[model samples]
Target: EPRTLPPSPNWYCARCSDAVPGGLFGFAARTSVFLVRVGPGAGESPGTPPFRVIGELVGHTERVSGFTFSHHPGQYNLCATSSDDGTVKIWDVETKTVVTEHALHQHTISTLHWSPRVKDLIVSGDEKGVVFCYWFNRNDSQHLFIEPRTIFCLTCSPHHEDLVAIGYKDGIVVIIDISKKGEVIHRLRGHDDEIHSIAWCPLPGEDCLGCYLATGSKDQTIRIWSCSRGRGVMILKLPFLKRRGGGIDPTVKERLWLTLHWPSNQPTQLVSSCFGGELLQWDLTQSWRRKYTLFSASSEGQNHSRIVFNLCPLQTEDDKQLLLSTSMDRDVKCWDIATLECSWTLPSLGGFAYSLAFSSVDIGSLAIGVGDGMIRVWNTLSIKNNYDVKNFWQGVKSKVTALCWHPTKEGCLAFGTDDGKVGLYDTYSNKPPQISSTYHKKTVYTLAWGPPVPPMSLGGEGDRPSLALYSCGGEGIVLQHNPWKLSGEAFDINKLIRDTNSIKYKLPVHTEISWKADGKIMALGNEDGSIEIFQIPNLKLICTIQQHHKLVNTISWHHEHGSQPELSYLMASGSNNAVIYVHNLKTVIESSPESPVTITEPYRTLSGHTAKITSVAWSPHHDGRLVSASYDGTAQVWDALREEPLCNFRGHRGRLLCVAWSPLDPDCIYSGADDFCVHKWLTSMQDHSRPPQ
Candidate 1:
């Protein structure tokens, strides 16, 4: 486990990394880079990723863009990591320490390459169009700053250590001599769109000092250029024939070659991987090489199913020739190139599994809000098929902090992002979401569709009446909106937070809010560790609970399904200090609608967690049954009526962020965490209701 989390870690692009040809592979996790040693066997391993942690390089201050290992024989373990914090660091993986750091570019470093021939030569590029070269052996640095076209891909020639190939957003490829202050040697351009990857032939040819270069671009073409002349030798383009019902169509946009690699062991061939399962193998041994489309991972569940970001070729001494591919799906798979079968596979957690909401109408439907604006909707009934899930990216760089299903609508789901744009999605449709204008301007923490206001209650005359969708977040106000027309009313919550009189900083925001089943009341947990009860529609302050000593992350009211009066009116609120308060809201809920009261003590205290509580929910299947997820890496089942813990499901290796109880299944529930895996487990033991509450 990591010793500690750096302050305000960003998991945005910690998602990108490369595997080492050595026994150890490194990945970016927040601002730190972790180097992991795989399990004992080189070719086969028991677990996914099958890793043993060595240590972490903890000096990077912001989002790590990319990282790579040195290729020299003597310094294979040496590593260089680049970050958006605008610094490049070199670390000794074995020594587990930083050797040196350089700050040559003020913009985030986009590309970092260490020469395969020169042991101390490293070339780096930034998005702001600056290239810097460091020759550690000579203690010299050379840099050149040009037009502000961002560097998209870069690499140093293995044959000519001083030569570097830089691709820019303007679709220009510049071959420069870093030893001569980045002297431009060749300026080549044939594509009209941006270039995504550039690679120099690594195999030393017969009587050849300089090698060929291959480039992939957004123009949907792979061009092999000559270093001897600033021109292309061959241009490869493939048209995608999308298979429709019983026919094929040629209009699909498929030829985005994201990576190009010529095997060092097989220099006569080149492999290209694109956005998905598009793989192209070019046989260059013949005078007129033919285009060879590879197997589309057609065997039993063999494809990436997601975008393959990097394809690494490996030829380790003890193992057979292999190819390693990393995908945005957070998995690494090695393929034995000879047999074209995956050799070994590994997986790692890249971001937070933030929110989980099960659908009531579609009992088997489950929607999860993962980081990077991704919402995965799963049919839990089909989960036993191994794995088949569909996901949608909102495309705005934001974390999906809130997901709420429409209580009355079948397939309508609401989602909120860190950017504060709320969207109502038709989960059954192609799932195109339309954004609502009730903007929060900060991370939205909670979303709830208030009981639809009856036309008679609102004094309406038309056939169509709007539902009140309430959303709250760091915006510090509760917004009630008609999501269809987008007109919203903002209810000021600052007035209810009485501690603001002595406040010296930003005002406290609601961390969580839950509307009671009847929609007559609302309970909002605050960053100030207070819980406020409000009379719905009018927004009158009804009561307050300020006993929690830290931010209250979650709040849940008892499932009011049964009509039994003796066992009703229990509420649960959890705080950051690892305490769950099961407050009996008997007096508050039973009081006159206009009357106000305060709760100082809780009815039942559940305080077993060692970290902040993340989410809690009352089970719909059982009376007085509740489940809670925590940062402590466990989900605890509690009997609210008895104030006792019943079972502990400690499965995830990281903090559990959100959880949900199954709508129909009485014994199963779901929990998700930063481990990037959502777990569905059956509670073998069931909780018994108290004899009479």
Candidate 2:
């Protein structure tokens, strides 16, 4: 009754097929880790692939959030993977199976590294900010417990076998002595940005001065630390060039150093990347002598692409040195080390699936927004169903924070970026998006579409001429934009939250809004865990529901399919605490700002999210069915009347960001998550007729 599909195979263009050396590249796409081998595919002639799909490891029960290859020459065939399922598996890359499995992590493992310093040693970090190290031969595990701060990057020092560097949120680096059983030595803090990336200079053997560690942070900054000194090494500032408009050049502005690589045995060379879509090579010896920069190869005036990260120095069998670079965007490009000409390109999926929607007007189109600001549409009803990986649109290097489809317009789709711009996209045509002149002032988190309502439908109010796009975010104001007329008006939920309270609630604003099916009574979900009800046109205040303790995430209203709203409706709201509260809010106008009502009732709870809830979608049908997604990698279908989970859909690997129930078929549903895939499944509710839980 339920099924899952892997993402599409990455695109390949082996331009250096005849000349380049064959190598191995393995990555985690959801729970599965695939090893793509370059050169002649299995059973193929001298031409290239279609990289030989030699091994695809699927032992992990959840998304493999991190994977690392064993760097020790003694055991080069071993690779380890970590998951939110609180398990780790070491795989024999020679085969597609796990050699051993360990489950000591009680939380989601976020980062992992195989030690180059110690043979058969691997370390992993989890969501609770705990680090665990495992030994393969002895099957031993140890935990390094500390204050709960997210551990972002883990690097084992090659020069000093006992030392390891752990980076985390807000530029904190901890140097630990793994040999002394996870003893912490020095806690270093020299920057304010998150230190997500770190590496030791790729030099051989022990040095008298100590191993030099390079750390990269959120603010496009980098620093080198000397292991011997408790403080660190000299700071390196990037050279900036000005543009015609007085701002820094796009090639090096507003960027984060996503990746940093030191050349193989090269002392004076350090490579870094930025959001400007360029790769920078700096000469460290002279600090200002010569930097051979590789601009993203494209139109001369406008270099349009993604920032190059994870640059690896590839040693060809022919000894022709090559620079291998993959991106936050999907493209495994091979460039000549001396010439800087890309010899080949490999294309994969975007960084993460942040949001997805099934267009009601175009029933067969499934659209997904990714962490890389790229949007794609899949033909849901096609024969192959996997034939199309059609490119939809891309934003200005911003994560897609929210997405919404227009109620009645076939081609109208609205999306918000992390940069705070809400734009209407014409899905039918390959044209520019219609961005509003005045819109959100900060990062937009959610957007919803409301169709034009007749005056009589909204308690005898004024008529709306066209559909309106409602958007809200970190900012307090919820701005409404009319796509047809293109004007911005604040929804004024700020006033509703501020005026309704004698108690001062911090961050007193809303996160999501849902118009009660027919665009009459809209329920607003807020940051301080309150729900504000408002009537359109006149913006009448109804009441505020205070049930959830954590911040509210999503809201949806349920109505009988046959008609319009009159007395009351079933309003369901989800929270960061992973509870869905179903409250029956009366639609009849009862209160105003002068005398506000703080409503409290025993609302039905739909539990079993296991983690933070992301989206809650009530069935469009008359039946009492509801579907909600979670960061736990599973989506659940609920019989809202029974207040129990009807079916548990474990199609996604992790972080089920969005879900939509199909209007074409009552049994069909779609979900997109942290993976490159979109999984749609048929109903599994009736599989058990005896007891539904």
Candidate 3:
């Protein structure tokens, strides 16, 4: 029988989007997520491109209930989205596709949460009141079935590894230990109706070993409970009506509370939303008091037209805090947290919004998911007036996984998406791509351009040159593409390994691929921690090198421009082992088909990272220097001669996803992370002088 599951609610805009180092925001809607980039002039009037759909991740067949952005070990752009289809999909946001999908529930997935302290570990509860814990590394999953009741919401503790809290439709909240086969730890009952939202307060000092949990319920109240024994501490009833001296009295008609947010800094501050379209702030320093109330001024006295679905806190560029809320009235409003005054509103959003997300890094960008299954991103800081409300991007698509510059064609670039499509575009236009084609069956995780071979070199008819491209992904296959001919085919790595009887796993996935300077040699890194070298044209197997003990994540080929021929060939590979191996490729390059050579031992092994290394890039200016991005929230520069890092970059709030050196300026380096943005950094080198004599 088909897996029939209960309904999974919204993992909408609030927890889905994050701001990265660059002015970029990522968020999810329906079956997709989008990356909205803010131009450099984000604070100016109307930013460039407004909204560009940088990514489109697709997998689930039903509307997305909830999703969380996370960096697991060395992974980036990683997210887990639950749906009503009784399935959970793990997506690589950077690639815009699902990395893994599992049918773990027989009912709708109510909520899913990623463990902040664990890699690839996720906790999700289904409508059947069943909680499941999944560990991606080992493909390990276990389920905890609660009594025959529907789960309304669930949340993982931000500070604990195995702690989780699940709320049921009957207003009962239970804490479970995920590590102990979902053992029940505590149960708290207070609210009169279904628990709609739950969040663990990220305050600094803990009253006990655990932090406080704030829950909002349809019973028209917000409550804070201790995590230790699920003891109820504070309860603030929703006051629907207040005697406003100027207007008709607002009534207390048992409004259903929808959501609540607890800031990490102020333990006493709580922001909440309700069905009556009211936004309220609560202060619990001494007593539970309503600090302020915000509603449309036009509906001050009478019944409100809009119903708030969700709201989130945003950090503005001017160091101010703003609350962004989405409503069923087809609009998103921004309010100042301090004064509880409406600062701006993005009205006429084409459809009623179901969710809202704020960029974790960009102060002015926001993403909203509407009823039309579309996500709209806006740069509120760039809004010049009420008329400047056009969205930057408004469509659903898969994520872009890999990008490369076109060989011999300036301003031309090629990129691969999660759906196995390759697109060619001209950056000058920044519009739709010139050409797009499906090149693979699964995801296209890595891409590289082959060296342009002149017609004279190939004994061809015209002066034109032929170019080739290489791509690899989940299929554990290498694809060779000829853009000029618009054709390509895959070479199965699994078949090659199986034929040799050297397979270590059932189906080792290919993680990365790189091309040598000459383009005749190609290297493919696999999940089995092996690097397979192949010759061009025929994709003949050269040799396989196993230097890492785990999956290889990134590989780069470096050659000194003016160095000696033999010493110039160097290849480096980074793996999930948190180590990098640099090898001398002189022997492999000189080997012939009759007698291929494989260098098993790396000349140097750099190991300072505390987590997986996502990407590695050799410096364009220096011969021995290289940079590595890691899931440890750090980017480090290392010299080939030393085992330690030269300098570590640490401003990112989350794990670093990718890193690269500027092709034109070696001093400039760029890094992208799960934090929802990209960062550019510059380095200075000393110049010798006669003390200005």
Candidate 4:
């Protein structure tokens, strides 16, 4: 089967459509497992099962750091997921087609949230601790929210659309007034651990809890903050509770059971789930302490055996039917709301459930996100156990870290996995690969494909062209030949080892490789800040260009000369402190080190990127024009001959990890960020003009 799909017409939003980060949210507050349709084919298989999955949502290769549903009443079905892979995906629930995917951030994203009032507004936080807010205007796919510092969690006000409170990793909460973009109304602090989850109280009243925010953290405590006083109003520690009494440590934030669920009628009565499979009901309405904690494992000695990752309420009514919990044990228990007595328990699945959501509309089918990366719809209300456990996921790689579906498409869905690979799958085949791999590997890190030229009549180029996959590991880029049609000749690196000095592994993490337009010469980067050029057919290292101060990140080739059509040159970029360099290959072919053709002239030192130049894309129409994205949080357009930056695409708040120029329209630039967002910008969108395009 083809690994990737053929490039289709540029996917553009219809009349007056906007580009926003799409995600899937599990709520983790009700059933042990729940599924949210973020991209496509996520929820379709709920009514069907066994042989076919519901849907496949594409995007992201790391843990989905954060996600939220659309707040526009009927649009609650729309979900979004932000990832450590540095890309945000948006999906239409009804159609199940991925509407848009944004490449934002350079490192890792920790949080993503949709505005309560604005239909297309979203925000995110990164590993570097920068938070950003962006919105898409009608028909204009431009970013609106941009901030600094990686936010940990986001809570939008139930009363106001403009009010948003974000919790940071440093145990600080900043409430932003969107109307006054530059205003920070409040900063609440108290917890000692990285805030894991936060939510504005959903209780309804004449004067609702507008100033209230509930936060869960690695500190093994749930802190309720009232922004009115700039401090926490109530702090509930899970590990210190009578039954839990200092059993769980506070250092493990990622593994801690840090979810808080507060129903409407029971405003002051809150629920908390611990990492050690303990559930507690805290009565905040009472001044005196009357905290009722429920231990899933009645035998305290066996508590460590079952680790609880999530907790959720089954109903909102007084003395509601409480769903006890699910864990790595794979068992689900339904509890009596008041007595904490086990009313009933569900059978065990093989894998652990990571997230859970109870559908208000469908009481029988509950969505569960499993550790195995599968989403199953369980029949909770069935008296005869009619639930068949329909699965709605089929991740291409291994374990999925994030999943979401659009607000409209019934069965459409999207999900991300641990491997640096994202895919789009639908219910029909339950196995379609859309956008198989987005080049750039912290894992698969980079791919080296040739700059297409006239095919040699001899067909010595191998039945299928050669593309090199590089990853940073004990053994450097383990070069693999074509899976399309393999040649008997293995991609042997020992053949190019003319000198004993060749390192065992020089390929860095996310190394970029490029083949010249003629497919005769290959330009590949290494971990040691060097770009090695190899002549094809024999794969001999011809030149070792050492210009980058750090690892050389990317390299591109210009087949036809800028001024002379018959001549060709190679252009390259480094991750650390290196300027763009160009070398004439024809000149190098004629000279020896004695009279070697030195890449003497620094054709252009494009210096707009502040940090590392993670990626670079050449303009298809103009060899002189190119674009670069970096850790410094900007993508710059540069000219091959000029020493100054020609244009600046500066909207990403986090490090710009990857950039891709449209193959058809070179002017249209797409960038992925560490903040889990992707942005599309045109070179000539502003004052930047097309250089004789």
lDDT of 4 at 207: 39
| Highest TM-score model number | 1
Total backbone collisions, model 4 = 71
Give candidate 4 regions above 4 Å deviation.
Answer: 1-53, 59-62, 136-149, 204-210, 239-255, 295-693
Candidate 3, position 427, lDDT = 41
* Model 1 C-alpha lDDT versus the unseen true structure: 0.68
Candidate 2 or 4, higher TM-score? 2
Q: Give the candidate order by descending lDDT.
A: 1, 2, 3, 4
Predicted candidate 2 versus true structure: per-residue lDDT over 436-509, tens digit per residue = 66657777778887643322123222444456677887675676666654544434445434443444555457
Q: State the lDDT at 184 in candidate 2.
A: 75
Writing each residue's lDDT as its tens digit, candidate 3 over 610-641 gives 88888887876677677888888777787765
- Displacement of residue 293 (Cα, Å) in model 3 is 4.7
Which consecutive 10 residues in model 1 have the weakest lDDT in total?
1-10
Q: What is the full ranking by TM-score, best candidate first?
A: 1, 2, 3, 4
Q: List runs of model 2 lying over 4 Å from the truth.
A: 1-32, 35-96, 100-348, 394-396, 451-464, 485-507, 559-568, 586-598, 675-677, 682-693
- The candidate, 1 or 2, that scores higher on TM-score is 1
TM-score against native, each model: 0.63, 0.53, 0.45, 0.40
Best by lDDT: 1
